[PDB]
Design a protein around this ligand. Structure first.
Ligand SMILES: [Zn+2]
Ligand SMILES: [Zn+2]
Ligand SMILES: [Zn+2]
Ligand SMILES: [Zn+2]
Ligand SMILES: [Zn+2]
Ligand SMILES: [Zn+2]
Ligand SMILES: [Zn+2]
Ligand SMILES: [Zn+2]
Ligand SMILES: [Zn+2]
Ligand SMILES: [Zn+2]
Ligand SMILES: [Zn+2]
Ligand SMILES: [Zn+2]
Ligand SMILES: [Zn+2]
Ligand SMILES: [Zn+2]
Ligand SMILES: [Zn+2]
Ligand SMILES: [Zn+2]
Ligand SMILES: [Zn+2]
Ligand SMILES: [Zn+2]
Ligand SMILES: [Zn+2]
Ligand SMILES: [Zn+2]
Ligand SMILES: [Zn+2]
Ligand SMILES: [Zn+2]
Ligand SMILES: [Zn+2]
Ligand SMILES: [Zn+2]
Lengths: 4, 91, 91, 5, 93, 4, 103, 4, 101, 92, 4, 4
């Protein structure tokens, strides 16, 4: 996933 | 030391935010990893470090992602330990 | 560490916020459990951890709900003890 | 009961 | 641990705020109990814990009301002590 | 008396 | 809790200069020594340490005395004048590390 | 004098 | 404590350079504690908050970090006092920040 | 006074570069060494540590001396120059 | 100089 | 490089  | 969202310190408090959760990643695993849904797509945030994560991929592991992106999290450290975090970063 | 609402540290100060309480759950029990009404339906909040609770059901135990939803509360810990909290979560 | 978001 | 309004730490600084205090409770007793008037009817606030009190009734003791409503106040603790606070709440043997 |  | 509200006014000269055209009956040097500096509003002054403000000075008033009378909790006052001085101003006797808060 |  | 705790991790900082079109290598910048803010080649340290812009080819992120922000705690913990002193061609006591030269 | 008001100006070079277009006579290197950095209003400078501001400089004044005269409570001044220096400036 |  |  990826940071917001 | 003090979590960014103390009201989400409890497992149940975090789990309930995933009421209408329609995403691949298991909500129980997300909650156990310290995450709670903020009500925007698959966006979640850690109750302790406040680190946010989105665009989860199927079978992704919440703790692994937590450790990969936010290695400085004190909740992650207390629950998983240095060896776990270091291994995730192959260090 | 420090209570979110120190002006609500006293039992009486919290109890008086229930002066017009007409819901099933007893106001004395709510106040003893650290809760005070915020003036919105049956919504209450803990003076210490700031944890809010709503939609009370008849016969519910304020202390038990406090421990279930906000196990991290320092007021809950100091008053009830770790054993009580663990038992609520069957740990 | 339930928490107030 | 630290007063909410340090400028009101002194007795005189608090007393003067009761300039034309016409209400039933003695202003000197209120000031001694750590309270100062905020210029709104009989509304007062403790310089230390910041706790506010209003609708004072005759014969009321400012210290007793301070202890009843704001038992967590550190000024109250340092000046009156545990025993006094517990007795007010009857919390004792 | 009463709290504010 | 221990640090001054206005550290830029910790020095005597820094405070003294704020009383440029001081047209009041109270000596500006005495005011500055007592920890006060003018804020540019009539004869209004404030302590660099406790932040306590004072106005409407009367002729022949002693800055230190007024400082102690109104702001007995000031740390600057305590460190410079001592507990004995403060207690005498308030005509009483307090404990060793006790602030004069009730009289 | 008097407090501001 | 670091100014931006969410950027404490290497990967978290690395991803901010997205497709990096500037002079200095993004991996080196990220390792040196920097993350891009979205304004040209402007970067900031996650710990001291020190910002840097207008990077030139072959510059060393750690070196620039030490030159401009010798007071950074992250720099101190990772590189140490001697490294910082050498960058400023000086030496100091075992308890003094390089703030005068 | 304990922590620096403007930590981003802790370094000598960081402060010196704020004088890149300094149009006054007072020496910029000396000002920067004394903990000062230019802000842009008149010839006003500010200490990175105590936050003390100074303006209306004389072409040949000594920044360390002015720092000590006006802001004797500055921790940066104390750590770099020491108590004796500060006391001497104030003839104590 | 003078303080500001 | 230079500071922002
Ligand atoms: Zn976290
Ligand atoms: Zn924790
Ligand atoms: Zn645990
Ligand atoms: Zn890694
Ligand atoms: Zn609570
Ligand atoms: Zn407590
Ligand atoms: Zn108890
Ligand atoms: Zn549970
Ligand atoms: Zn109080
Ligand atoms: Zn106190
Ligand atoms: Zn006392
Ligand atoms: Zn009671
Ligand atoms: Zn003072
Ligand atoms: Zn002091
Ligand atoms: Zn002294
Ligand atoms: Zn007195
Ligand atoms: Zn840095
Ligand atoms: Zn660090
Ligand atoms: Zn390292
Ligand atoms: Zn240098
Ligand atoms: Zn030094
Ligand atoms: Zn300074
Ligand atoms: Zn320093
Ligand atoms: Zn002097």
């Amino acid at each position: 996933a990826v940071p917001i | 030391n003090l979590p960014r969202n103390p009201s989400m310190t409890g497992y149940e408090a975090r789990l309930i935010t995933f009421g209408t959760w329609m995403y691949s990643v298991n909500k129980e695993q997300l909650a156990r990893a310290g995450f709670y849904a903020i009500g925007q797509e698959d966006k979640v945030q850690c109750f302790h470090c406040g680190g946010g994560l989105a665009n989860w991929k199927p079978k992704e592991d919440p703790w692994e992602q937590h450790a990969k992106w936010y290695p400085g999290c004190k909740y992650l450290l207390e629950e998983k330990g240095h060896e776990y975090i270091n291994n995730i970063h192959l260090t």
